[PDB]
Amino acid sequence: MREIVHIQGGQCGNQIGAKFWEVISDEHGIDPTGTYHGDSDLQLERINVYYNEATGGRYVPRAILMDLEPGTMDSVRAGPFGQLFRPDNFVFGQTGAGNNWAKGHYTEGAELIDSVLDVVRKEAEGCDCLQGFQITHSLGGGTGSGMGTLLISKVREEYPDRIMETFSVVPSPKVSDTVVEPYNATLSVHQLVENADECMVIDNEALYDICFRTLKLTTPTYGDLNHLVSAAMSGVTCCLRFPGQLNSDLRKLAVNLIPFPRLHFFMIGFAPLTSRGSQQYRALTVPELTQQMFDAKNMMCAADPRHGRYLTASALFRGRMSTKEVDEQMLNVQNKNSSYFVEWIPNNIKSSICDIPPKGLKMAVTFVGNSTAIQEMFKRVAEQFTAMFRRKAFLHWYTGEGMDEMEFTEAESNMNDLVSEYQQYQDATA
Amino acid sequence: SVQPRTRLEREAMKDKESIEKTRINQRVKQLLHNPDPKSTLFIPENQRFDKDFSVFDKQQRDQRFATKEVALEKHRIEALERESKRWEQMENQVNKEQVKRQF
Amino acid sequence: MREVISIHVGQGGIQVGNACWELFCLEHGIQPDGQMPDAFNTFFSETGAGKHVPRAVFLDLEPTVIDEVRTGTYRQLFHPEQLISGKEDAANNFARGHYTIGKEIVDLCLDRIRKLADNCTGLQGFLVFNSVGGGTGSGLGSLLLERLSVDYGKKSKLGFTIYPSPQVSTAVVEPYNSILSTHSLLEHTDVAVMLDNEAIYDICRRNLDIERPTYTNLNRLIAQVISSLTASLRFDGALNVDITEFQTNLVPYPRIHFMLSSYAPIISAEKAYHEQLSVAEITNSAFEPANMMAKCDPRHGKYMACSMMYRGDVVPKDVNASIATIKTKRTIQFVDWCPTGFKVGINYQPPTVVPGGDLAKVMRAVCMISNSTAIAEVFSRLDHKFDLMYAKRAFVHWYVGEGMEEGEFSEAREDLAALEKDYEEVGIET
Amino acid sequence: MREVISIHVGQGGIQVGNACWELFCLEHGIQPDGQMPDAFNTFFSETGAGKHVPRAVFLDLEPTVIDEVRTGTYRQLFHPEQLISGKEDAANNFARGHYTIGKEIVDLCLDRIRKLADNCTGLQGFLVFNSVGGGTGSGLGSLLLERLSVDYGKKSKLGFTIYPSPQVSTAVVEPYNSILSTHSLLEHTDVAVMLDNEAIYDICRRNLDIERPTYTNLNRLIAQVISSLTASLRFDGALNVDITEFQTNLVPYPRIHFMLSSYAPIISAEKAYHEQLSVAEITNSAFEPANMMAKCDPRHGKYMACSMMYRGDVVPKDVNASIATIKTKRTIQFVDWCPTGFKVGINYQPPTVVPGGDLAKVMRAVCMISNSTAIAEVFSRLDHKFDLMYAKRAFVHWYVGEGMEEGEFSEAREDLAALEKDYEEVGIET
Ligand SMILES: Nc1nc2c(ncn2[C@@H]2O[C@H](COP(=O)(O)OP(=O)(O)OP(=O)(O)O)[C@@H](O)[C@H]2O)c(=O)[nH]1
Ligand SMILES: Nc1nc2c(ncn2[C@@H]2O[C@H](COP(=O)(O)OP(=O)(O)OP(=O)(O)O)[C@@H](O)[C@H]2O)c(=O)[nH]1
Ligand SMILES: Nc1nc2c(ncn2[C@@H]2O[C@H](COP(=O)(O)OP(=O)(O)O)[C@@H](O)[C@H]2O)c(=O)[nH]1
Ligand SMILES: [Mg+2]
């Protein structure tokens, strides 16, 4: 019951899913052949959340994979746990977008999306009670940031009451791999605010910083960043698949973390994270988890959370632990940092406890906090956008496929209005 | 994995002009009924009479599927080999740090 | 399901095509006979049983080079009737190969192009090679580009033209046809890469330590650059780049698409292994002005956008740590309206070595394609050379008597003046 | 993570660099081929697998010495393209190597310096060696120091210059360029050490009992002094000293940084073991005026500060018990405004012996770097020699015709007069 379907688009989203599904399968004891080989009874009670049942007793994820080029899905199939995905759900084009948002949203993405919407509708109509959808995509690419966001609007138009999740990677100015990143980032943020019920920003720069400083491993690769993102993704829905002292589905988090409908851009972080050589030194206790959870360097975004004030915060503890300690520590982390918490909403931290810890760990915490410090990312994105747009650089590529500069002006104005009205509440006082 | 041996193995380089030296050193037709055995076109006379696309296609289709299956197992193994080396190297790094400290 | 077709016209084009086609056959394990003793599909096609046929066509009006090709070791590889050959050479006269003898040959080439294109299903685009300072090369390249631009339309075409050196020259009349061909391909080619011989001679002399190079050594380096550019289409990589993802990242405006390339490392086996060839030092060497593949000084102008490809065991974090260092340096400055200008690609396959060649085997390499404002100097000096002889109308009778009109020379001069004004207008800060 | 770069310019500089680089390779166990059959990092760099590359660069305009280096046993050690060589010698003319031929070579040297510096992460400073009484040595040393002082700024540079002897001389024009180079490095070098040949000849004759010494015997002693100075950076010690901890202890004022060195013990194996070589007797021998490494009498002036390094099994209490004895003696008097003037360093690694050399193996050694007021005599005698020929303007035409102005000789004379007045002003008691 109350299950969700998985939809991913683009190369970055496909690579994120290729590790997210591996993590989920390892958590539920599903072999790469789809056969259950788990140890505990609880591993099968709520498997309908992510997995479907077919004849022969094997399980198949309800994931939908889409891209405008076939290479990435032809590569993910040969990887481990690549056989679980149903071949029918693979939809792809023969041309690609070339990191051009217009091509992936107006000319090419519009004709292809009917086929993927057909299978999306097939998956949603069938399921017992829908909880919602979760979306993984990147804002630094053309086909992803175009087709995914148009699909968001199409899904929202047909299921207005369901919940919608988006895990979005925004292009940081530090590690830049594409010159046309500001254009399709700014165009995508315009559409994303209007339809997504929840959005979670993730930055490659913050992932590299975490890998270099906390884990202290010499050579980070995309596999480590994907593993961290996958652990963070799994931590959110853990209590929906396992029993606990205070169950809290996604809708309950939506109620408690979004004060106003347009303020739904969160930054997350996962604890504990320790190096291989120091994993024996540390002792896992609730104070040790909560001190690392609110650490500024532990956030999955380069945004500095002590440059603003938290509107609200959430924590999803895992493992068996006493609730009194959790509540007193949450109170203590809020009394010692009163300057960084907005004062006109008292008791702005939500907590939840799940009795099933991750495989290999005795305690774990997932942190989701809505803070005013996120304005800095939109500020720098808009700064680069307005630095590049004033000369109409690279504009002809977009304008040759039916798009105009008016949609750029409206997007810039709406993004600046969002930036302004997000900080409006930072200076608000009672 | 880019790799080279020891200094001794290369043994050509201490102010070599051999490379310069090497450059100096260089200073009623009947072809319709008779397609070549190598060519695709040639169907044996003895087999000229199997008349079923059905059976033949099914066997051919089965073979065409199988090659892809073995290929998939092999390419995935190569993927596994890069990753295994990286996992091993990180573990190795910890052991090594440990080794120097013990030394 | 991704394909590309390479066009070779003229003596220089055929001699660099030979150079790239030893390298591709060696890199995909195909013997010179064409027989192997799923990545080949980008450049080759399967015949059903046995040999592979290149997706390339060789053009020339003068039969000597084609006859040399059809008797060498590669006689069995190419299809016998795609090596189109003429009888009479254009003899460095541009008007000949555009109005007199090229028209009767161009139809066969277009028929061959159609016959090759109907086989491909995922055609990415075309590649073309032609030495600009010759009659048949420039004229037939212009005519083929003009026919293809209307037969196919939006398909992408890439041109690896070899402009004459600043002072070193083999002919005496090459500025005329160079200017005319630049006129022709200015409005007809999506990408043009600079390849003059003097810079590559200096590269060979300084790094490879060869004091008597021949054309083969130059063509091998060009072949390596081509292989590095197209590796991402036929090998698995952590950060892929497609051909169609260029005009969205390197071409700010439709007129400006001339850029100059560089490659690193270039080193011989006698002293290659004594140094570690880290990613930082190779990416520093690639940006050195003395390692430009065209004899232009980047210190004399701004950068617009840099697209640079890696291959081997490089890790993205090391790439970011080196892009930061380059942004730090005060001798390299980017244009004002471009905050980030780097597009990064990472591939896993190390560069392959050709036996008996110059380059050694290494695990890391970098190839950069950079668009800069300093390129206007070659246009200015070619224009100055053209004006000196056009003042007295020298050598014009060799062109007027081959069907070309008198006024055709002036409008090419006007288009070059327009291009030079445009390059100055773009490079000024706001 | 601590590094230092040594610069060798001129024939004397290269011939002493060879002397120090046999010693370092022998001391760190590296074979002449560069292959070992974590202390090396100060002078060397790891290439990833196998050989080590020195952090040194050799400069000369006259190719004979470099060609001798590139064919000896150490041909495989140095990187082939850091042995920068010219074509035409300066021929003892200072104006040549500062204005005519050195300018075209200095750019390559600066590029090499940058390429070596980007590799180091903890760069302590630079070392430079140059015989002062020569054209290319003095001129290029001056130009390199002047370029480095502005390219890097506050990084420390140490100069081991070899001034001419009081009466013994090889050239006839060396006072001119000696005075000019002293002018140049007076305001540009942080430390300058005196090294004239006559004193070391007397040391060899008296102690080593060699009646026919050559330059190699002198250079080996200089190499031993360098090794003793830099031992504290690469070996464990009870009382460490860094290079940056000098201008705070030996340099009372920015102008005064010329000091003279001494070493002890110096003894041959034929009679070394007959005596116990206690710390007291070696520290007494080090302060003997006849064992100064520069031909100056310390009895003619006050001491300002003494920095003296030990290595071996010496115990600090024995060092203190010997510093007290020296303070007791009436023939050694310190300046009034300096109550304590000794800086002591203790290291555990005994000095290493070079096979076939002069010095024997001992367990204790002492190297002193002492700043004294008596150094003004060498300046006075060089000034007197300069004035004799500058009165009649002899040999000036060889300098005016190489681009140098007429007045450039006078201001060096004025700066020497200022230095001599400053040395007199400092040495008077309050
Ligand atoms: N890089 C490179 N350039 C070449 C080579 N061969 C010729 N060129 C250049 O080509 C220019 C002249 O054009 P060519 O290619 O030789 O002759 P063409 O293009 O066939 O034109 P025609 O003279 O009519 O036959 C010369 O200025 C050369 O610089 C080559 O092998 N490598
Ligand atoms: N201690 C020592 N001094 C040397 C040695 N070789 C030369 N000198 C001194 O250097 C002075 C002259 O400068 P050189 O180093 O010989 O020549 P240079 O510095 O290269 O200048 P050029 O004459 O232009 O080549 C002489 O007066 C010598 O005293 C040496 O091997 N050891
Ligand atoms: N975490 C992670 N990020 C990736 C990976 N591959 C690419 N990216 C990011 O995705 C961005 C490029 O997105 P792109 O591939 O063009 O998206 P597309 O246009 O939808 O295919 C780069 O800036 C990378 O930082 C990966 O394997 N893992
Ligand atoms: Mg020709």
Ligand SMILES: [Mg+2]
């Ligand atoms: Mg000399």
